[PDB]
Structure 1
Amino acid sequence: NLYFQSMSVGFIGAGQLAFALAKGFTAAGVLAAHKIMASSPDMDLATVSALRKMGVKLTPHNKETVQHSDVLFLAVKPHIIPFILDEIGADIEDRHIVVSCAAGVTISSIEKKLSAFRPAPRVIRCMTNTPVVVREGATVYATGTHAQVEDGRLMEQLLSSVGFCTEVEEDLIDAVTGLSGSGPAYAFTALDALADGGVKMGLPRRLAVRLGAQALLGAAKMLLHSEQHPGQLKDNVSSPGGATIHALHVLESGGFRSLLINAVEASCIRTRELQS
């Protein structure tokens, strides 16, 4: 409570992630909308329109966002980050916690750019995902060289208000991107395809969408609340000779498992490329 009581948050970038976080934070009750500020070069964006309706102060100047924020989220594409650290770098102060959300961008790279201005910049690296908008995000963070003990603690409480959150070593964050960072996109693909199959077999599309989504939600919650291995839960619900085991067979015949492994791998490797 005392963490967020006298806390101001700014977003460099008013894109998809910034709206999701701002929307998650306000819905959780941790931050008030008017106490949040975002800067965007293009105010013609859709997210920039939705954020204004929320009551989020918007500005074109990143230097304005830096001046009126304590915790500063960097929610821009990785290639813009060094151009932004050169723009607002002289405005970073001792009180700023800089939370980097750009994929791939290492703590070392941010600290190197900001250490040329003030010596001990407090930096945290973050991999979250869009379901923070419904407070069911998956977030990890690593603390940088000069982050104080309370800084990790403040970050953990804030990000926990909108989903799962835990600290990791920074070298795991590329892998987390490929799993839970890109994860929701795999799920949306899967739901579109599952609804298509429902439609093929005679269901109205709207019902097929709803039923597929409820199935995934329930199965994930079930796994999260179980002590049990995913395979054991698969085994429990697969009756001998039944419909479900017949469907699992056709998933196995297309190498379904290898495609998800391929996906996690390809997103992680792309994240490593964007750093280098």
Structure 2
Amino acid sequence: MNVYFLGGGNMAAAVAGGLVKQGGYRIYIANRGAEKRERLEKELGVETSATLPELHSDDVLILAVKPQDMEAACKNIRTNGALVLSVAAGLSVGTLSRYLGGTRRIVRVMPNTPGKIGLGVSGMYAEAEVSETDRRIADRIMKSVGLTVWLDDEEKMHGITGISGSGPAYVFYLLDALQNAAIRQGFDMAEARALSLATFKGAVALAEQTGEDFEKLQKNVTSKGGTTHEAVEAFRRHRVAEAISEGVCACVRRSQEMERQYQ
């Protein structure tokens, strides 16, 4: 089964690479610039081209261009009833339908950048008119790069952005936060980075393996009048977790704003 990508950038290359490891797809990437077709061909060994070939109802098309270039990109594309996925932000299924001239055979994806390493999380959404078999085809495609999470309401696609879409940046911010607290305690940049990385990696593996509630895990290791308690009381006083929720709201507000730009 053919999987065409419209757009040869990072997300396209993550999912294409994903599909190559999975096996049994024919990958093909339309991308206007030669430079980056050169890379894909050398690294993944996928076919590429400046334009798409004729599509058929038995193909998949993955739309992977930046949102603002999407209407132009889709302008003269004839899907011929192919299954369409899109990974572009802020472009609703109805907007996508318009762009492509009426087809409803569309699944939306909100992936994130650890998918580049097979650790992604992809929010997924399809209207009711989209068959279960098409959902399953889309779902196995996005599972080549990580976790899928299907949503009932297209609106929750903003929640995904707020949590898993932009969340890796929050984690980088918090890694850096801990690295910097380590430098303040007298560690050189090398130790402070290693400390912070290993701290996060090991706490996260513990949470994963136990499946215990995050809060239950925090409390299990915060005896009253002890060192951990002093730190987490400071976190609480400065409303750290709350500010995290505020940041998420500001992110989801802005995703909502941005989406009104094209519908």
**Please, which of 73, 93, 112 is the counterpart of residue 107 of structure 1?**
93
Aligned residue number for residue 11 of structure 2: 17
Distance of aligned partners of 1:49 and 1:101 in 2 relative to their CA distance in 1, 3 Å threshold: same
Q: Does the CA-based 8 Å contact 1:52-1:58 persist in structure 2?
A: no
Q: Does the CA-based 8 Å contact 1:100-1:126 persist in structure 2?
A: yes
Distance of aligned partners of 1:202 and 1:36 in 2 relative to their CA distance in 1, 3 Å threshold: farther
Aligned residue number for residue 178 of structure 2: 194
Cα distance in structure 2, aligned partners of 1:275 and 1:84: 18
TM-fit CA distance, 1:187: 1.0
Aligned residue number for residue 36 of structure 1: 27
Amino acid at match of 1:205: M
Unaligned runs of 5+ in 2: none
Distance of aligned partners of 1:263 and 1:231 in 2 relative to their CA distance in 1, 3 Å threshold: same
Identity of aligned residues (%): 28
Instruction: Please state whether the residue corresponding to 1:174 is helix, strand or coil.
Output: helix
Distance of aligned partners of 1:242 and 1:173 in 2 relative to their CA distance in 1, 3 Å threshold: same
**Please, which of 68, 73, 78 is the counterpart of residue 67 of structure 2?**
78
Task: Report Cα offsets for 1:71-96 as digits up to 9, x if no partner.
Answer: 222122222222222131xx2012x1
**Please, which of 245, 252, 257 is the counterpart of residue 241 of structure 2?**
257
Cα distance in structure 1, aligned partners of 2:142 and 2:53: 24
Aligned length: 259
Amino acid at match of 1:165: T
Task: Report Cα offsets for 1:227-263 as digits up to 9, x if no partner.
Answer: 5432211101113333322222332333321221122
TM-fit CA distance, 1:11: 1.8
TM-score normalised by structure 2 residue count: 0.85
Cα distance in structure 2, aligned partners of 1:221 and 1:66: 44
Task: Report Cα offsets for 1:157-190 as digits up to 9, x if no partner.
Answer: 2322322113212221111111101111111122
Amino acid at match of 2:221: V
- Structure 1 or 2: more helix by fraction: 1
Amino acid at match of 1:231: E
Moved over 4 A (4+): none
Matched, 1:164 2:130: no
Matched, 1:185 2:179: no
Q: Does the CA-based 8 Å contact 2:161-2:252 persist in structure 1?
A: yes
Task: Report Cα offsets for 1:33-74 as digits up to 9, x if no partner.
Answer: xx32223334445x973664222333222x34957x922221
Task: Report Cα offsets for 1:88-138 as digits up to 9, x if no partner.
Answer: 1xx2012x111111111111111233344xxx4410011111111221111
Instruction: Please state whether the residue corresponding to 1:165 is helix, strand or coil.
Output: strand
Cα distance in structure 2, aligned partners of 1:80 and 1:223: 41
